[PDB]
């Protein structure tokens, strides 16, 4: 299986502010929550814009 989704946390809400903030910020993903040892910033790409299904 190897699944990562889950049942607990939602990011389809994160997204309508991500998407947003993009439009005024633009910073090298500031918010974050989660890293994989020592990436950042691809970290948040790397899971939204590659999944594992």
Known sequence: ???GSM???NYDLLQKQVKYIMDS?????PQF???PQ???M???L???NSNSD
Do not use: R
């Open 1 to 3: 299986g190897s699944w």
């Open 7 to 9: 049942e607990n946390v």
């Open 25 to 29: 910020n633009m910073l090298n993903l």
């Open 33 to 35: 929550q989660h890293l």
């Open 38 to 40: 020592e990436e950042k």
């Open 42 to 44: 691809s970290a948040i």
């Open 46 to 48: 790397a899971m939204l």
